[PDB]
């Protein structure tokens, strides 16, 4: 005669997580994906009677409502028929086998589940438990659906990555530990949504809106930067990083996200764009939005909505910091994979999201989503942020001379193809560079490209073309470029006119941050070159280590400029940014890596200077190889001395993993190393 009550519940966590593709997270919680059933075993006191029934109630967030679909009340039946459902699969004794399902349109996040029991004309409710519901890229009806297994593994399940960096003259790469499976990372990424400006202002609407990956993606693009909202990372492109980490020293998202949380959600210092993108990639992959990291070389910042940026030099060959716009050696951002119900079926697929604080959008430093397809066709009136993104990959560039001691500027040239090159992302299943420029623009030099350019420009808001120049100029590198060694370049000029010409050349070298921030002059010279018709000449350029050492930043970049002129013709501007090599830093595993077995690693580094290096630190990390971030204090190394440092790691997950290190010291900040390790069962 006892009234119907719940004894206990088996959530079958391990089994359900494997089925839901959530088993990798380091977490004891039940983590599920939306639109997919999960099975529980619920043990009652008595067998059900007629006149008895069970309902489940699920809710998420602080103001759950049925109409906003943040609360659902659904009966234990045989029926499915839309929304949330609970199918009684079998009864055996007082044990019910139950298959519970959520809709493909369910908001993501943390849910509570309760049971409402109808027995003897009574109604009661008991809280059962809590779970996490994520986006479901395995489900054909999910907006984030990604139908290719191998792609899904890369774009959702892979926690080690590669971000392309450097310049058009030398594309390099750094490893990045996404670490979306590491302790507390999924939880921290869910927290982000609970701290945005939108959540603080109107949590009921924010929570309802977490069914939409456009909305989640956009919120993350705001919350990963500190601006406006005390989000994760504070940007710094000044070359002075006092009070924080040099942006280049980070090797992943894990310590950033943990350091944010554990500081009471106060900004982490400091980031540059690949750090924002790395961290945004982690959050996206953790929540189930397939995502990848894009690098655009020669990336324009257009601040005034005309698809053109200006760069300025003085007659002496100094680059000038003038006007708000700029051109970056590279800029990194993200793509997330989802359909766009707001735009129409032709604009689904890859969508640009950018957490780097550049432009305010709707009053906030956020960016995207922008359909990549829509950018390539210049449909820049579509949501979101497409004028700014089109300009990054395809603005025209105008070079100007400016002489402050006349106040005159004059137009030197226009370059319609230099912006937006070698747009790169990590290959699926390897570290190869995949080139995706053709996804963002029609080919440089095609008619399409120029037609797309004018269409886009149309959607928004006198010179004389003098002779072909007599002089053509080019800068070439002579030999090695390595911090600690001299720089040798050659300026090659040629006179293509029929007359003898006398060329006046004014040359400078400035240390720069990779976004084009000028740090300091380190060398300058002038030269006069007499050239016969068709004669080529070389002018050697030499910059000592002593000359650049004090002003070179962790970017290791120097901007070399030569402004060349002959009487009665416009200046010719010759330009090269160089990157100087760090000293070599290697990691090697001294045995084969096996799950759960210690394995010794060795770090080698040779000090190439004639001076000692001090304050030597090695930071190491890699998901599935060690837990968190190891710090090793390395003793002062004498000139030309080598360091040999050994340490154990403890592989926890089989497969191809990535070990990352940073070696910083007084004379060399942020030397990077990366080792792929095969971890066998």
């Amino acid at each position: 005669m006892a009234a119907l009550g719940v004894q206990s519940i088996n959530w079958q966590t391990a089994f359900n997580r494997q089925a839901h593709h959530t088993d990798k997270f380091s977490s004891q919680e039940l983590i599920l994906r939306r639109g997919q059933n999960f099975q529980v075993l619920m043990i009652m006191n008595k067998g059900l009677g007629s006149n008895e029934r069970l309902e489940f109630i699920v809710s998420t967030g602080p103001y759950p409502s049925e109409s906003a679909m943040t609360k659902a009340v659904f009966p234990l039946s045989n029926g499915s028929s839309g929304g949330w459902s609970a199918v009684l699969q079998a009864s055996n004794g007082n044990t019910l086998t139950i298959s519970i399902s959520s809709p493909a349109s369910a908001p993501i996040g943390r849910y509570t589940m309760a049971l409402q029991i109808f027995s003897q004309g009574g109604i009661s409710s008991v809280k059962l438990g809590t779970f996490i519901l994520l986006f479901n890229p395995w489900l054909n009806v999910d907006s984030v659906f990604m139908g290719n297994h191998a792609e899904r593994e890369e774009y959702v399940q892979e926690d080690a990555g590669i971000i392309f960096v450097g310049s058009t003259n030398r594309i390099g790469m750094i490893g990045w530990n996404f670490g979306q499976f590491e302790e507390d990372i999924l939880s921290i990424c869910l927290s982000i949504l609970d701290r945005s400006l939108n959540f603080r202002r109107d949590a009921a609407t924010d929570v309802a809106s977490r069914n939409d990956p456009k909305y989640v993606g956009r919120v993350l693009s705001a919350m990963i930067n500190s601006n406006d909202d005390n989000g994760v990372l504070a940007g710094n492109w000044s070359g002075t990083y006092t009070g924080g980490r040099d942006p280049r020293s980070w090797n992943g998202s894990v310590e950033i996200l943990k350091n944010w949380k554990k500081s009471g959600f106060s900004p982490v210092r400091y980031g540059q764009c690949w750090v924002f993108a790395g961290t945004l990639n982690t959050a996206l992959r953790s929540l189930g939005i397939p995502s990848r990291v894009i690098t655009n070389f020669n990336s324009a910042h257009d601040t005034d909505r005309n698809l053109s940026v200006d760069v300025y030099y003085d007659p002496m060959g100094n680059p000038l910091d003038k006007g708000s716009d700029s051109v970056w050696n590279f800029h990194v951002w993200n793509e997330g994979w989802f359909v766009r119900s707001d735009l129409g079926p032709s604009y689904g697929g890859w969508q640009v999201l950018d957490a780097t604080p550049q432009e305010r959008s709707q009053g906030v430093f956020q960016c995207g989503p922008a359909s990549v397809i829509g950018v390539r066709e210049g449909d820049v009136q579509l949501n979101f942020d497409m004028p700014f993104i089109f300009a990054e990959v395809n603005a025209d560039r105008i070079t100007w001379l400016y002489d402050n001691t006349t106040g005159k500027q004059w137009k030197n040239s226009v370059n319609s193809h230099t912006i937006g090159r070698y747009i790169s992302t990590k290959a699926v299943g390897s570290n190869a560079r995949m080139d995706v420029t053709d996804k963002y623009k029609y080919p440089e030099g095609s008619d399409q490209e120029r037609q797309v350019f004018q269409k886009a420009l149309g959607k928004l808001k006198l010179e004389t073309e003098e002779q072909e120049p007599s002089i053509i100029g080019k800068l070439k590198v002579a030999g090695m470029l390595a911090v600690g060694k001299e720089v040798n370049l050659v300026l090659l000029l040629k006179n293509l006119s029929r007359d003898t010409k006398t060329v006046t050349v004014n040359m400078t070298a400035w240390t720069i941050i990779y976004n084009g921030t000028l740090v300091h002059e380190v060398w300058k010279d002038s030269a006069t070159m007499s050239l016969d018709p068709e004669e080529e000449a070389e002018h050697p350029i030499k910059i000592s280590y002593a000359q650049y050492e004090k002003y070179l930043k962790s970017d290791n970049m120097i901007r070399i400029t030569a402004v060349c002129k002959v009487p009665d013709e416009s200046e010719v501007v010759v330009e090269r940014d160089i990157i100087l090599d760090n000293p070599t830093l290697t990691l090697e595993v001294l045995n084969e890596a096996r799950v759960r077995k210690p394995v010794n690693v060795q770090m080698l580094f040779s000090n190439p200077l004639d001076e000692p290096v001090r304050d030597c630190v090695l930071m190491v990390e890699g998901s599935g190889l060690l837990l968190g971030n190891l710090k090793i204090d390395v003793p002062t190394l004498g000139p030309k001395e080598g360091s040999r440092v050994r340490f154990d790691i403890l592989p926890s997950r089989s497969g191809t993993k990535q070990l990352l290190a940073d070696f910083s010291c007084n004379k060399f900040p942020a030397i990077k190393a990366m080792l792929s390790i095969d971890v066998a069962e």
């Epitope: 006092t242 009070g243 924080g244 554990k262 500081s263 009471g264 106060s266 982490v268 210092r269 837990l627």
Partner: antibody, heavy 122, light 111 residues
Framework: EVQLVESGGGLVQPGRSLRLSCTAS????????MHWVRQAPGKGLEWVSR????????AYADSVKGRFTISRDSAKNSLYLQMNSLRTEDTALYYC???????????????WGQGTTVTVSS | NFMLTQPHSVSESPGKTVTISCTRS????????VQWYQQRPGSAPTIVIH?????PSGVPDRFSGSIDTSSNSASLTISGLKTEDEADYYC?????????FGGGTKLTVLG
């Protein structure tokens, strides 16, 4: 290696003042928060005060608020605690400590000096 | 604000494992990093664990830290105890304002 050397300690009657100094060397001073932590003979550790890397954020324990002032000087790579209206329960060994954390507002004491003795009694 | 509560004393024999708890009185232990320090008579404290469970350069792998959300506590575990491990130990955490220390535990290595 990091060295923290505290000075300015001594004996003083209730009501009077002392100025503690801490010289830092062997790391980049201005990258870190710094702290005073004190220990009374035979007792535990009691945090006294913190000052951010850039001096802009300061915090004090309730038992010293309004009477002690923390400050630092970049050029002198030094940390100070100006203690006014001293009470007998301020008697302790005063440690200077470098914060562990670089680039986040979490707090831990990675290196401690040997301390400077403050004795308050009539 | 919150308190951190440690046992007054623990003991164990040489070669064995001993654990020292540190219970946060309000808010979640997980919210802020925990540090551990060792102090010997006549000496300033030294750090033995930072960031809940990371070991500084120099500290033996016999020392470990952990966190237990269900008891709202942090722990320091020392295995293969040696006589030189006998000392006072302190936990420490913080909120955005204030740094908080545990009251200290005297570890005796039973002789």
């Amino acid at each position: 290696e990091v060295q923290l050397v505290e000075s300015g300690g001594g004996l003083v009657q209730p009501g009077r003042s002392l100025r503690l100094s801490c010289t830092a060397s062997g790391f980049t001073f201005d990258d870190y928060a710094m702290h005073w932590v004190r220990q009374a003979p035979g007792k535990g550790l009691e945090w006294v005060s913190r000052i951010s890397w850039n001096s802009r954020s300061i915090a004090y324990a309730d038992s010293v608020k309004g009477r002690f002032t923390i400050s630092r000087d970049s050029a002198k790579n030094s940390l100070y605690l100006q203690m006014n209206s001293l009470r007998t329960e301020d008697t302790a060994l005063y440690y200077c400590a470098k914060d562990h954390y670089l680039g986040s507002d979490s707090y831990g004491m990675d290196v401690w000096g040997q301390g400077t003795t403050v004795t308050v009694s009539s | 604000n919150f308190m951190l509560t440690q046992p007054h004393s623990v003991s164990e024999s040489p070669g064995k494992t001993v654990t020292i708890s540190c219970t946060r009185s309000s808010g979640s232990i997980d919210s802020n990093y925990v540090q551990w320090y060792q102090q010997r008579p006549g000496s300033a404290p030294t750090i033995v664990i930072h960031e809940d469970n990371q070991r500084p350069s120099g500290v033996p792998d016999r020392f470990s830290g952990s966190i237990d959300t269900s008891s709202n506590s942090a722990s320091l575990t020392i295995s293969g105890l040696k006589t030189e491990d006998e000392a006072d130990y302190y936990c420490q955490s913080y909120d955005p304002s204030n740094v908080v220390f545990g009251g200290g535990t005297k570890l005796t290595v039973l002789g």
